[PDB]
Amino acid sequence: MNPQDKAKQAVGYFAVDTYVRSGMKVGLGTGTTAKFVVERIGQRMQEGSLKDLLCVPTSEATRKQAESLGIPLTTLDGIADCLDVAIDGADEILPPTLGLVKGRGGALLREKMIAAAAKTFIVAADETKLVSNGIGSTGALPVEVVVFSGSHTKRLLSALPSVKRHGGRAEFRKRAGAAQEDIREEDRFVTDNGNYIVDLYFTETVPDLHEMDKELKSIPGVVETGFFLDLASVCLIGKADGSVATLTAE
Ligand SMILES: [Cl-]
Ligand SMILES: [Cl-]
């Protein structure tokens, strides 16, 4: 595998080895890094060191992967207390507050529901996910939006003061497939919750995340944002050489 994937693998395995134990209720992320987390839980099960485990997937792609490996699955409805731990990746990680940008794989809503329901929310990422001064340098800030009047909601997002200030441009997430100021409905990515996703790109770095998050949320039709603020408790960062750095809040 390439250097980036050895890093994603090392950090996923590490997360599972260090924080997951038998009898826990575990949240499972979505994406190429979470793939290795799921894969490691599957291995420890078969090896006999992980039992009586209840897991909650953040996407239908994640359940399908965990299903194919015999990992027990449910939703937050079937959990009485809180998840002990939730493990997921991130698209951007802003130390030292550990504010994140998530949602580039389309699963922001449930990832946030699962993260908020966990006593400890753990992010596992490779080194390229770390940013400085603010967000928006590696890509888009996703915003989940309802289907009805989606284009109009996209335009509203574009016009928010914080978004104009940072030179924001809006665009719909495309489904995997072929590809005027908007794309056609059949080409728009639909989340597991039946919603579209509006991606915001900026020409400059956005340093005030809390301010922007409130503005994005002031628009009716916005279901959820890619900002994960004051949620990550721990952020694991892996390198190709297999080592891992641990960032902790408080
Ligand atoms: Cl995602
Ligand atoms: Cl578009």
Numbering used by the authors: 1 to 179, 187 to 257
Verbatim from the authors:
Toxoplasma gondii is one of the most significant parasites that impacts human health, with estimates that as many as one third to one half of the human population are infected. The genes encoding these enzymes were cloned, proteins expressed and purified, crystallized, and crystal structures were determined.
Ribose-5-phosphate isomerase is the enzyme in the pentose phosphate pathway just upstream of ribulose phosphate 3-epimerase, and it has similar functions, though it catalyzes the transition from ribose-5-phosphate to ribulose-5-phosphate. TgRPI has a larger α/β/α sandwich catalytic domain (residues 1–127 and residues 225–259) with the Rossmann topology and a smaller α/β sandwich oligomerization domain (residues 128–224). Residues 180–186 between strand β8 and a 310-helix (η3), Arg258, and Lys259 are absent in the structure due to their disorder. One D-malate molecule and two chloride ions were modeled to interpret additional electron density. CL 301/A is bound in the oxyanion hole of the active site and coordinated by main-chain nitrogen atoms of Gly105 and Ala107, side chain carboxyl group of Glu111, and two water molecules, HOH 415 and HOH 433. Applying crystal symmetry operations PISA predicted that TgRPI might exist as unstable dimer (BSA of ~2,430 Å2) or stable dimer (BSA of ~3,340 Å2) in the crystal environment. Homologous RPIs form similar stable dimers and, thus stable TgRPI dimer may be considered biologically relevant. Perhaps the most interesting feature of the determined crystal structure of TgRPI is the disordered region between residues 179–185 that comprises a part of what may appear to be an active site loop. These residues and 310-helix η3 are unique to TgRPI and might be important for catalysis.
